[PDB]
Amino acid sequence: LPLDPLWEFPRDRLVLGKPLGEGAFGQVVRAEAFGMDPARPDQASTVAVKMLKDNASDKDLADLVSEMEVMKLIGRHKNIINLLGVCTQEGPLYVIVECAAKGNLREFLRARRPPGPDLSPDGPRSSEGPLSFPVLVSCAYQVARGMQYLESRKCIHRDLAARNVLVTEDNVMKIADFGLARGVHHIDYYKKTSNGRLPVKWMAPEALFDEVYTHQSDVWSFGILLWEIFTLGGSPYPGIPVEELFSLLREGHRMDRPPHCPPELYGLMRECWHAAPSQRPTFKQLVEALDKVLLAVSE
Ligand SMILES: *C(=O)c1nc2c(cc1CN1CCN(C)CC1=O)CCCN2C(=O)Nc1cc(NCCOC)c(C#N)cn1
């Protein structure tokens, strides 16, 4: 690999720490960076490091190198996992990105579901869950903002889900893994992830049936993400096996309106799930529509 002085960071200024998980595109590892700001050489900062496994092919290297160059080109936005630096010299390939200490949005929501009535009343709010409606709207808005930026940078996140949206310490939404070479030509539509996810339930019809991805494919996926948000991490198409998902999509079946969800947002969901991709809202339109809702419920 060639030296890029613009993004190059001394590997000795990185202290790797407890792994965050591993997948087809390598492993993600939490780490501390010293002097990520060149103005303050000794200041510590908390980052995340993308790397390869011990069992990696030269294809896996090319894939990670690919993701590196993608992040170099897309630039900074508050609502995406930004590239901070890289380590390409005299050691293993480290791609240093931002950290999101609160984990992915799905787990974030599932951990903060309101207490069931089986718990005894203790305190003036003992029935008041961590998550309120305006905050849930804000999460949706932040994801839409970032996706609109990614679209303007001509980037198609072909898997957009609550699982791939990370939450910072300050409860800021950040889109992750938007530059992966996801290998769309060989998707096992039936295989379930180790945590039980069936990624096919986020795929737009033209992507699932015709292998076609556009920015409107992500708008569809964003519509599913909206469903995830207002079910507080619920699994889409509940109880429906992949085989039944196939025929239901061909009939044009859509998810019902989830409980405790206003018609304004289920409306946006159904707009994102329109058959013709040209009749789904753009990400710019989603931002504006979600903004009006957010402004309405905030005094
Ligand atoms: C940041 O590295 C970080 N991220 C996560 C956790 C902890 C930390 C760092 N950290 C903060 C303070 N605590 C007390 C100590 C500490 O180590 C733990 C929760 C989960 N984090 C996380 O998911 N970070 C994360 C993950 C990423 N990958 C997403 C896919 O997971 C494989 C990415 C990226 N990209 C960025 N951050």
d(CA 246, CA 240): 10
**Helix, strand, coil abundance in the chain, percent, nearest 5:** 35, 15, 45
CB 175 within 8 A of CB 162: no
Instruction: State phi, psi for 80 to the nearest 5 degrees.
Output: -140, 150
Instruction: State phi, psi for 84 to the nearest 5 degrees.
Output: -110, -35
Q: Map residue 250 onto helix, strand or coil.
A: helix
CB 244 within 8 A of CB 222: no
d(CA 86, CA 84): 7
End-to-end CA distance of the chain: 53
Positive or negative, the CA dihedral 25, 28, 33, 36 is positive
Crossing angle for the helix pair 283-296 and 133-152, to the nearest 10 degrees = 160
d(CA 291, CA 294): 5
Q: Which atom of ligand 1 is nearest to the CA of 31?
A: 2
CA distances from 87 to 14, 137, 155, 173, 264 (A): 10, 38, 24, 26, 46
What is the dihedral angle through the alpha carbons of 277, 278, 284, 286, rounded to the nearest 10 degrees? -60
d(CA 199, CA 4): 35
Kindly provide the residue ranges of all beta strands, DSSP E only, lying in 135-255, ordered along the sequence: 165-167, 173-175
CB 255 within 8 A of CB 236: yes
Instruction: State phi, psi for 34 to the nearest 5 degrees.
Output: -110, 115
Per the listing, tokens 């910072």 go with 168
Instruction: State phi, psi for 102 to the nearest 5 degrees.
Output: -95, 5
Catalytic residue among 159, 170, 177, 256: 159
Residues 6+ apart with CB under 8 A from 279: none
CA nearest neighbour of 235 among 290, 278, 193: 193
Is the CB of 21 within 6 Å of ligand 1? yes
| 177 classed as catalytic | no
Residues 6+ apart with CB under 8 A from 24: none
What is the dihedral angle through the alpha carbons of 90, 94, 98, 99, rounded to the nearest 10 degrees? -110
CA nearest neighbour of 184 among 215, 154, 159: 159
Cα 37 to the center of its chain, rounded Å = 26
Is the CB of 99 within 6 Å of ligand 1? yes
Considering only CA atoms, which residue is closest to atom 17 of ligand 1?
A: 30
Report how far ligand 1's centroid is from the alpha carbon of 83 (Å).
15
Considering only CA atoms, which residue is closest to atom 10 of ligand 1?
A: 101
Per the listing, tokens 């309405």 go with 296
Report how far ligand 1's centroid is from the alpha carbon of 104 (Å).
9
Q: What is the resolution of this structure in A?
A: 2.6
Residues 6+ apart with CB under 8 A from 106: 161, 162, 163, 165, 228, 233
Query: Residue 249 carries which DSSP code?
Result: H
Is the CB of 255 within 6 Å of ligand 1? no
Per the listing, tokens 């999101």 go with 100
Q: Which fold has domain 100-295?
A: Transferase(Phosphotransferase); domain 1 (1.10.510)
d(CA 64, CA 80): 18
Report how far ligand 1's centroid is from the alpha carbon of 48 (Å).
6
Considering only CA atoms, which residue is closest to atom 36 of ligand 1?
A: 99
Sorted by where each begins, the domain ranges of the chain are: 1-99, 100-295
Is the CB of 28 within 6 Å of ligand 1? yes
CA nearest neighbour of 163 among 98, 237, 108: 108
Two tokens, residue 179: 């530059």
Which helix (H) or strand (E) is 205 found in, with range?
Answer: helix 205-208
Residues 6+ apart with CB under 8 A from 292: none
CATH dotted code for 1-99 = 3.30.200.20
